[PDB]
Amino acid sequence: MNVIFIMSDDHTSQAIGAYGSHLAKLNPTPNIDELASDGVVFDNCFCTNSISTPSRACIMTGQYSHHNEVLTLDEKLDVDRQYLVKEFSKMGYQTAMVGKWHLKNEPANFDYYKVLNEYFNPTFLTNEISNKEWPKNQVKTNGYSSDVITNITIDWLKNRRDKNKPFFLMHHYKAPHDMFEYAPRYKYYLEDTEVPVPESLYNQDGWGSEATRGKNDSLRHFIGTSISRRHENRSYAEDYKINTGDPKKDTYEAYQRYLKDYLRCVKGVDDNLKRLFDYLKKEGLWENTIIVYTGDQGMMLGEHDLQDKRWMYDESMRMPFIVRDPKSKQRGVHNDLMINNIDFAPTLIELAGGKAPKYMDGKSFADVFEGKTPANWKDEVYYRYWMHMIHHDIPAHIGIRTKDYKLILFYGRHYDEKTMGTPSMWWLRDKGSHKVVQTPVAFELYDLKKDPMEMKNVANDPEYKDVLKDMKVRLAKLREKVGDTDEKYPKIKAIIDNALK
Numbered sequence: 001m002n003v004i005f006i007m008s009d010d011h012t013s014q015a016i017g018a019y020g021s022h023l024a025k026l027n028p029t030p031n032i033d034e035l036a037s038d039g040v041v042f043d044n045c046f047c048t049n050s051i052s053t054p055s056r057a058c059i060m061t062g063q064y065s066h067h068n069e070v071l072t073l074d075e076k077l078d079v080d081r082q083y084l085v086k087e088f089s090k091m092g093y094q095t096a097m098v099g100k101w102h103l104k105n106e107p108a109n110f111d112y113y114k115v116l117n118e119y120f121n122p123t124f125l126t127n128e129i130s131n132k133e134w135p136k137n138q139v140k141t142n143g144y145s146s147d148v149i150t151n152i153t154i155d156w157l158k159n160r161r162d163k164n165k166p167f168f169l170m171h172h173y174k175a176p177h178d179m180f181e182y183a184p185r186y187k188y189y190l191e192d193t194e195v196p197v198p199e200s201l202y203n204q205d206g207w208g209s210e211a212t213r214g215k216n217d218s219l220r221h222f223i224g225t226s227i228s229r230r231h232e233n234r235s236y237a238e239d240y241k242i243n244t245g246d247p248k249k250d251t252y253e254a255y256q257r258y259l260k261d262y263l264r265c266v267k268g269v270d271d272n273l274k275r276l277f278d279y280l281k282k283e284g285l286w287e288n289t290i291i292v293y294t295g296d297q298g299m300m301l302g303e304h305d306l307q308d309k310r311w312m313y314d315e316s317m318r319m320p321f322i323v324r325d326p327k328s329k330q331r332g333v334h335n336d337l338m339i340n341n342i343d344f345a346p347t348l349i350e351l352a353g354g355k356a357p358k359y360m361d362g363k364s365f366a367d368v369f370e371g372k373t374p375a376n377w378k379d380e381v382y383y384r385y386w387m388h389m390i391h392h393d394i395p396a397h398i399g400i401r402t403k404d405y406k407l408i409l410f411y412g413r414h415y416d417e418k419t420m421g422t423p424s425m426w427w428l429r430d431k432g433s434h435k436v437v438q439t440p441v442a443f444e445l446y447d448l449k450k451d452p453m454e455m456k457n458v459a460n461d462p463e464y465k466d467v468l469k470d471m472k473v474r475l476a477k478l479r480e481k482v483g484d485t486d487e488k489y490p491k492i493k494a495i496i497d498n499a500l501k
């Protein structure tokens with residue numbers, strides 16, 4: 001069967017109606033919900049490292065960041081590590097890459113590519129041009145990027161695809177990534193509707209730890225960019241220049257404007273999927289094509305007064321992940337198996353008739369689509385955010401999540417010693433940027449059954465003493481087992497080993 005892998009940049013699970021959040025009553029994604037109504041919604045799909053380039057490298061390689069080497073936004077994925085597409089090509093698929101490309105090197109292992117690397121009249125690099133090589137093979141387009149990107153894929157399917165060969169197509173939207181430049185036809189979408197506000201926008205009593213707030217909350221203006229003006233250097237309230245005279249009203253108005261601009265970008269993607277899905281039905285591909293819809297990671301939409309991703313908190317860590325397999329009987333169902341973006345490539349390869357590659361860290365959960373739990377499937381996932389402080393003043397951390405608990409260890413250092421001591425926000429160099437410095441080392445523990453919104457860090461609660469001890473052992477063992485043991489980074493190894501002992 002064919003495969004279309006659709007991924008939107010920073011499309012978080014709260015903003016898909018099928019995940020049933022407080023936003024779902026706005027019906028933000030009717031066409032994604034219709035896809036979900038005939039497929040599987042995975043409730044427990046997590047990235048291992050919540051930023052665009054690392055997550056996409058995990059998808060492409062089936063490997064953890066410390067193996068594929070894409071630790072942060074700053075790194076590139078080697079061409080010869082484009083494993084997912086190389087495996088499909090080896091099964092005789094024609095391969096195509098369309099849209100937003102974060103992996104920096106040429107998509108050279110794709111038969112066809114037309115990529116960004118721009119919200120209006122985007123320019124693409126594409127090997128449809130004969131007399132120019134990457135990165136000079138550029139083509140200008142007219143119009144809004146979500147509409148243009150959808151047309152590139154439909155035009156490829158209609159006019160270029162070899163109709164006698166199966167295809168593997170990665171279809172990547174730039175929306176709804178910052179700066180949420182939505183198409184002007186959506187300017188008044190939601191204009192008169194209040195976006196539901198999470199109570200954690202204002203109430204953070206019990207959330208976090210000394211690692212994320214400082215002793216005596218001494219670092220709340222330092223760690224974690226904000227919706228409110230809590231963070232002294234970067235916030236939506238300041239960026240939007242909202243100044244009503246009431247800081248809670250400022251926070252409310254910045255939240256509303258953030259969420260509405262974001263949901264207008266989501267709406268543009270969802271409307272374009274109607275056009276793509278209608279084409280696939282008309283062309284006769286709907287019943288022989290596996291369709292995946294996912295976001296590369298989640299996003300904090302103001303929960304706990306936080307923004308962006310990177311955090312291991314569930315809104316950022318969880319990826320929306322919807323699969324419609326037309327040969328499966330799992331249609332209109334949810335599945336709670338604990339899965340990672342590193343599992344996507346082996347699962348897709350098996351769903352397309354191949355064998356899970358043994359050099360990958362991830363494993364195939366393809367059995368789910370036959371109504372069976374895969375053999376010896378993990379009940380915990382590992383998480384690590386490496387990019388200490390840069391851009392959003394979020395400290396580096398590792399963690400483990402089960403179905404029942406999440407344990408986070410903030411180790412609060414950058415792995416690159418030369419980066420320690422630099423400004424975290426380059427645009428505020430010599431304008432008061434915080435510096436990339438050691439932040440407090442602490443654990444956070446969340447009881448996910450009683451406290452799914454992660455409002456209450458119970459790491460220091462006596463009632464949770466045994467759970468904490470057990471979770472630290474589980475974290476220490478998983479980290480050793482996946483090989484993320486920091487021999488290259490002695491200062492961090494010492495912090496983490498000492499904290500887990």
Ligand SMILES: [Ca+2]
Nearest residue numbers: 009010052296
């Ligand atoms: Ca992203």
Ligand code: NI
Nearest residue numbers: 056101102103
């Ligand atoms: Ni990409």
Ligand code: NI
Nearest residue numbers: 145146174175
């Ligand atoms: Ni787009």
